[PDB]
Amino acid sequence: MNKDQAEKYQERSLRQKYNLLHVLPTLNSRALSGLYYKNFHNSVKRYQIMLPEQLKSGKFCSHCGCVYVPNGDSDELGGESMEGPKKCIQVNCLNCEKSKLFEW
Amino acid sequence: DRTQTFIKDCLFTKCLEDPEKPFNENRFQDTLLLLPTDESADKQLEKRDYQRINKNSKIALREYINNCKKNTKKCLKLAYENKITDKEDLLHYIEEKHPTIYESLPQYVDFVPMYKELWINYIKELLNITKNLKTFNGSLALLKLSMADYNGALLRVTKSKNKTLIGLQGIVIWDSQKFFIMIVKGNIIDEIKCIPKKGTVFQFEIPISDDDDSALRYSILGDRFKYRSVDRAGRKFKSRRCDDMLYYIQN
Amino acid sequence: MLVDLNVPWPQNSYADKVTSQAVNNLIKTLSTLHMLGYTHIAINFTVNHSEKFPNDVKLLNPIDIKRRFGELMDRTGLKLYSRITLIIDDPSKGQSLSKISQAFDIVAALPISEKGLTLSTTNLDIDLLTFQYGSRLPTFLKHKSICSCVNRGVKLEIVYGYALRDVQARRQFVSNVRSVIRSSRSRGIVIGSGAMSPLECRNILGVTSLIKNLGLPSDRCSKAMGDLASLVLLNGRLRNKSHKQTIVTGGGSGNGDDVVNDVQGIDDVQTIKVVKRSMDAEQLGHASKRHK
Amino acid sequence: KKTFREWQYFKLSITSFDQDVDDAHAIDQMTWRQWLNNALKRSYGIFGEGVEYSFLHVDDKLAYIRVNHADKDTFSSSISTYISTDELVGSPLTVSILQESSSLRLLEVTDDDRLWLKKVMEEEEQDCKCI
Amino acid sequence: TPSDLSESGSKLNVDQFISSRQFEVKQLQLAMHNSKAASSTRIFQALPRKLRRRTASHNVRRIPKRMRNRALREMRKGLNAKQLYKARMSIKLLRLASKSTSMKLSMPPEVTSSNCHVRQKIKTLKRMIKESSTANPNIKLLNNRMGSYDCTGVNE
Amino acid sequence: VRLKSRYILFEIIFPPTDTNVEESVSKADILLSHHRASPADVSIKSILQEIRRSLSLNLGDYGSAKCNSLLQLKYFSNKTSTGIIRCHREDCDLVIMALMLMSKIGDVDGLIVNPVKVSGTIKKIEQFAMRRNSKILNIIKCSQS
RNA sequence: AGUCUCCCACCAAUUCGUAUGCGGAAAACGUAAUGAGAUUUAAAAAAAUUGUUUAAAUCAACUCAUUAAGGAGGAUGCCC
């Protein structure tokens, strides 16, 4: 297998995983979201490449694995709400009953 | 050593019966060995949250499968009770009389359209399906297909040890290690299909309709689909027996 | 089903040119094997090891199944396969299997020495192990080696068609067959007929009678000619056609479109299979309900 | 527990190529017998020569041979081995056993010679049952 | 030199060892057999299978994992009745891990009794068992040093 | 695994075919007149070639091919006319029938072959040969009186 | 069958004086209750054994981490 041809295959596979992470059900169903998240991460761990932190921090959830999205293609919103600090700013989701807290 | 070997032989001819047995089979060691016999914080955070997400998604998939299993049974029972045959009446009746059991039911018309296209385009770009078909190479294409991902793929069971599993078409929702998960549609059938891979034959057809109406005829073998590489290469393979494929020739 | 995998081709070196009489005799013997009854025939081609392999791909196979066997099959009704036997005795540096293995279908070996036997049993990727039944056996064959080989793959082949050549060769043939059957534990045995003319061919009953007189039970002969021959054809076919048993280039719909059975449909200059669109997403999944 | 088989039948048929030499010469019963006597002596010694066999319903390239149940192996190993050479034909002869039977139940044509042989064989059958 | 020092350890060569000592072997054989020394036949016979034994391994032993984990827990780390047995087992495990070679080979590197300070722990726990208020003269006073008393039940 | 061997002990006996001379009727007299001696033209390759010819002449082609796989003469000396023929446990009957059907040596005539002991090891064959040799001496000592 | 382990002299003790889940003289020995784990792990992946050689929807299987023997009192659950 040519490495120049393997780079294109790697890019295509990464794009395909990232697209499968999205469309309707991974947003709707937490099971498919978590499964595809685990698959994408197991695929990116084997390629010995780090992933950007600016997306790594605020991309997915920690209990199910759905993308944090509040309210071309109308879909379902990802999070219950996003309050102010109120003591410390938190973000809640729809699928599970937990929240993620960040401090200023 | 020659006179020494003669002395050793004249000594062994007293104890042993064949003096030139050990020197021939190399049991008289010339040497006697004498020796006593002789930024990690965020990384750990990411590993732990990944472990937690995996452990949650497993249970979520399991309970989703169980919910679909029970919902299909209950809705088919209610349909037979109400005597309604086609799906376009049954789903509307359930929606207008049973709100809850309807948000648990899946929708094939929701599952087919983007999945099929997003997998077809991905495979077309991977196998380099071009308007002309003189730029192909079978070896590299088969290697890519062995390395390719089948998450959200359309496969048809064409041969199997069980005479009832054959002929089932479905699109992948998740790739397990022992069973294969797809979804099928019928008159009222909306069953999630789990199929064993040990002894079954699958196949996938890629449509190509630029000028003529042709398609590629590819196929996989589940029995030997368990010991393949995943997204990478360089895994030392072993010849197993190539012997339990008798069902392939038999029928 | 009956399979004969050692039909010899009248050529040993690439410098030789086959005359029309040999091709006519081969056509006659193929017709003879077909008339009485047979299912699979794989012709054999023999070359030695120390020779210079030609640095070509489109000239390695002087069989041209589509040229003349393409003339014969439409009237005959059976299939042909191209196989090669390697006469390897001394481990010289000449080794270019990466071309002849992919160009041919079945790759066998003909060891004469002990080192060649060991390397062909351990490292050489072959399909059948054939011995020189005309000459003397290289050594006292071991049991564990043959058992581990037949568990790892390659089986032994017995050719009863050589005993019809002369008188002095029959004793050596029987002595070698006895040792092979005794050392192989009667597991990986494949039977073939190495006849060059249709006059030295026999019926399946003569074959099973000869082998049952040799020492192997008749039911085992039937099983090894029915299932083991099909399996050794399948292995050598998909090891070259497909990848390492992971992805198959052929899709079996019914009962005739099989990777070893379907031979005119599947392309050989490439590995693609151009079929019309027959799988949609709107058709009912259940084949019992799906109607056209 | 088991019934003792007297002998066993064998369906013999000649296969001679070279249509010209084939239609040229015409084999007969004595030809068959000489071919068998040559095959047995070529493949075996006195062991093969002392094999009991008779001829029943000899035809053009067709004949039926009954061999004892104890010598079926010797007969079937010698038949598929020998190839005639310069006996009566310019093209050497090769024989292939079509089928075998141990219950006399075989019928190719609707002739009556099989019926007569069957009649004499059952008049011997009841005779060995009583005797 | 019949034995020398080399890469791994000491090497002893049989060749020179029996070469230098040859006349001694001749005198020994003459002292054992007088008239049979001139003859060369089979004097020694095969060992009976009843006396025949089997060969063991060249290693010392493999310690069970339970005792190893307990010794690890003890080394790395008024009294109730169970705390008496706890301290007793603690001193026993310390002594065992100190003497045993298999446990030493199963112990983790960079761990010694000096660093563990076994002696002070032994002293403290022995002081505790001494405080446990036992009554020795209630048990009995024996007659010999090896355990041998009389266990006879009269009418019971 | 083990190769199943079966050694065969045979004796060459010369019948005193002479009708013009009167003979003594006893045990040791006929034992001596039958165990006189073997001729000088007697060896291992001359007996092996003769038995190989007789095997092909009596059994045939396949009968000699199946039997000549492990047909060897391990021990034989012309002073006592005792030989040990190694063969398979399958072809023991064939070798015995061939030794029975032995007609004559190509230059020496008037002799018979007697198979005495058949066993699957050489130690028991040697023990039986020693026992037979010891038994032979008894009648000799008794008749020398 | 196997290039696995151990017994086949003893030692009121520099001699594994080891009352440590149970059985066992020992054993790279059998099994029982709970929790967790997957080259992101305590450790399986890019000493022996085995063609495939644990798992990675749930079950089943492997690995590791805890539970010392007997008698008495109180509470809870079952027939009563």
Added chain:
RNA sequence: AAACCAUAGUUAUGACGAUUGCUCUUUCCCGUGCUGGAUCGAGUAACCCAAUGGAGCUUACUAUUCUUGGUCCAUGGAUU
């Protein structure tokens, strides 16, 4: 110079004949049934083999190349 010792013991464990039983199939009867009975037939497996004795573990076997018991949030058909 012997300790020489096996309810197989040191390249051995042969040769056929006869009987019952076990699995399927083409038949007839009482009561449906009953390790209910009798004819026409096929097969009795494979791994494989001791060399001093015992225990534990792992690894090879049972597809017309004998069998048996149970389980399965495996699928296939039918009733509620």
Added chain:
RNA sequence: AAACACAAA
């Protein structure tokens, strides 16, 4: 052949 070894392969 079997059986043995901190061998050798």
